[PDB]
Every structure is written in structure tokens, then in C-alpha cells.
Design brief:
monomer; alpha+beta; Phosphorylase Kinase, domain 1; Transferase(Phosphotransferase), domain 1; globular; binds Limertinib. bound form; Epidermal growth factor receptor; transferase
């Protein structure tokens, strides 16, 4: 492989301010990163034992090694006690909560554009030989309603397959459930489930079915149902992401092309009723 010359930035605790809690259950805070002597305020998210410190530094390693407009930005780490992961603040939350809270106001243009942007981010990760292993609507953050990015690389592995603990069964490819193989094509399966989440405005996949039953359901040939707004063109793409033969599933490069074609005439492919001073974003602080 090539030498990973990415830079790991160490940030002083004295450079962070206005810290409020965004969510917990670790904890994630919202705040402002003010680099000393820079006249710049960066809206940031701050994610917070030896085992906890090892895993958070693994995610810091991954996020420092990726740079793409549709992959979340790592700004640095802070070595205060428990290691803190400092990333770009995405002020509209995760896509899962966003489609649930704004169902009655999301048109076909936004849905298909999100599918394009997620596929662009995953295609970049594939270029970097990175398998996400946890692609889901909850792990796609919203910078603006027109710009989303993939997040949460706690399970990501650099690669061929990966052989592996606890995992999101209802988003995993069948070969990942049965024999624990993870590939870029197993990520494609998760992409199909993620699209199904968006097209259903936040429904839970296999709602009410225990995770221990998912592998037997998938082996029988059963899949997630066709969402009401989805034409057969869109649902066919999702079904192709859920093929048994991993090499028969679409490639991320191909998902970009197909969803971009659809985004040029979105109402032909999604049928939705009523469809007709010194603050600097991290994307501009290079
Ligand atoms: C799906 C939950 C969620 O993402 N909520 C959220 C997120 C942000 N913005 C943001 N920006 C960057 C990063 Cl790294 C994060 N990280 C994060 C991960 C997991 C998580 C779980 C629960 C709550 C927050 C959270 C954050 N997040 C944001 O910016 C304003 C707001 C929200 N909220 C408040 C959605 C509502 N909340 C889930 C109750």
C-alpha cells in the first residue's frame, strides 16, 4: 500500500467555546473552535478508560485519511483526559431524523440528490479501499438540505474482504450476517437499505422482526417492500442492491450515474403528493 501521509491535528482545549450537548447515551457536544490568532470561529461537534481511547483514536485515524465533499471532515483531536473527536458541525442533524421531521416538505429532487451524494461519498471511500460497515440513514449528516455527508467511521476497515462482535443486522448483507464477510459490495447492500429509509421518510426496516430472524427471512428470498412513492425504476435499483450474488449488485460508480439521470427528471421517478462576524464553516477553513 501507499504511505498514509495524513496529518493528525492536536487541538488545545482552550480553543473551544460555547459547548452545549447535542446528544448522549459517549456524548456529542456542539461548540465553536477558535484557532488561536486566526480571527475565525469554526462550528464543531465534539465526541467524547483505555478501551474507549483506543476505539476513538481508530476513528480519528480513518477520518484524518479521507477528504471528500460527501465525507465528514475531521478537524482534529483533543487530549484532555478522554480523547475527544472534533469534527465539522452538521447543523441539520442526521438524515434519519431529518426525513422524519420534514416528511411533508421533502420533494423528489432532494431525495434523488441525496442518493447521488451518498453514492459519491461511498465511491470515494471505495477508491480509498475503505469499507464503512455501518452505512445507514442515521449515519448521514445534513450540512444543508442540499448537502449531506457520510459520518460515523467507528466500524470502518481498510482493505478482498474483511472478517470480523455486535452489528446492525437489518442493514447488513446476508454474507455479512452468516459468515461475517464485509466488502464494498456489502456496503452496497447497506446503501440499498439506506435509500429505502429515505424513500419511506424514516421507516424502520423489518419493523417488529427480531434481528435473529433476519438471516432466515433473507434466505427465503424476502426483501423490504416497495415504498409508496417509488416507481419501479427506483425500487429495482434497491432490489439490485439486495442480490445474493455480491458481484451482481450495482457498483457505487453506477449508482451515481443512474440516480443522477433520475435527478434530472425527479417527478418521473418519485411520486410525492404536493411535490410541485468571523464564523467560517470547516469546508472553507483549509
Ligand atoms: C441522528 C442524530 C443526530 O445526528 N442528531 C444531530 C446532529 C447534529 N449535528 C452533528 N454534526 C456533527 C456530528 Cl459528528 C454529529 N454527531 C452526532 C452523532 C450521534 C448523535 C446522536 C444523538 C444526538 C446527536 C448526535 C450527534 N452531529 C445536530 O446539530 C445541530 C443536531 C442533531 N439533533 C439535535 C437531532 C435531534 N436529536 C437527535 C434529538
Amino acid at each position: 500500500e501507499a504511505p498514509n501521509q495524513a496529518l493528525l491535528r492536536i487541538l488545545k482545549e482552550t480553543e473551544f467555546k460555547k459547548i452545549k450537548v447535542l446528544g448522549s447515551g459517549g456524548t456529542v457536544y456542539k461548540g465553536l473552535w477558535i484557532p488561536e490568532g486566526e480571527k475565525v470561529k469554526i462550528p464543531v461537534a465534539i465526541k467524547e478508560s483505555p478501551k474507549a481511547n483506543k476505539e476513538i483514536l481508530d476513528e480519528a485515524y480513518v477520518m484524518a485519511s479521507v477528504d471528500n465533499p460527501h465525507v465528514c471532515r475531521l478537524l482534529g483531536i483533543c487530549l484532555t483526559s478522554t480523547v475527544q473527536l472534533i469534527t465539522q458541525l452538521m447543523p441539520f442533524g442526521c438524515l434519519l431524523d431529518y426525513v422524519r421531521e420534514h416528511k411533508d416538505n421533502i420533494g423528489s429532487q432532494y431525495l434523488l440528490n441525496w442518493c447521488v451524494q451518498i453514492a459519491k461519498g461511498m465511491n470515494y471511500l471505495e477508491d480509498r479501499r475503505l469499507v464503512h460497515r455501518d452505512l445507514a440513514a442515521r449515519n448521514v449528516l445534513v450540512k444543508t438540505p442540499q448537502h449531506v455527508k457520510i459520518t460515523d467511521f467507528g466500524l470502518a476497515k481498510l482493505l478482498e474482504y474483511h472478517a470480523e462482535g455486535k452489528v446492525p443486522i437489518k442493514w447488513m448483507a446476508l454474507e455479512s450476517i452468516l459468515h461475517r464477510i464485509y466488502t464494498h459490495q456489502s456496503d452496497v447492500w447497506s446503501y440499498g437499505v439506506t435509500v429505502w429509509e429515505l424513500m419511506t421518510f424514516g421507516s424502520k426496516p423489518y419493523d417488529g422482526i427480531p434481528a435473529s430472524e433476519i438471516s432466515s427471512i433473507l434466505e427465503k428470498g424476502e426483501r423490504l417492500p416497495q415504498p409508496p412513492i417509488c416507481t419501479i425504476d427506483v425500487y429495482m435499483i434497491m432490489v439490485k442492491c439486495w442480490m445474493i450474488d455480491a458481484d451482481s449488485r450495482p457498483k457505487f460508480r453506477e449508482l451515481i450515474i443512474e440516480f443522477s439521470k433520475m435527478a434530472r427528471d425527479p417527478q418521473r421517478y418519485l411520486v410525492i403528493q404536493g411535490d410541485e462576524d468571523d464564523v467560517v464553516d470547516a469546508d472553507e477553513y483549509l
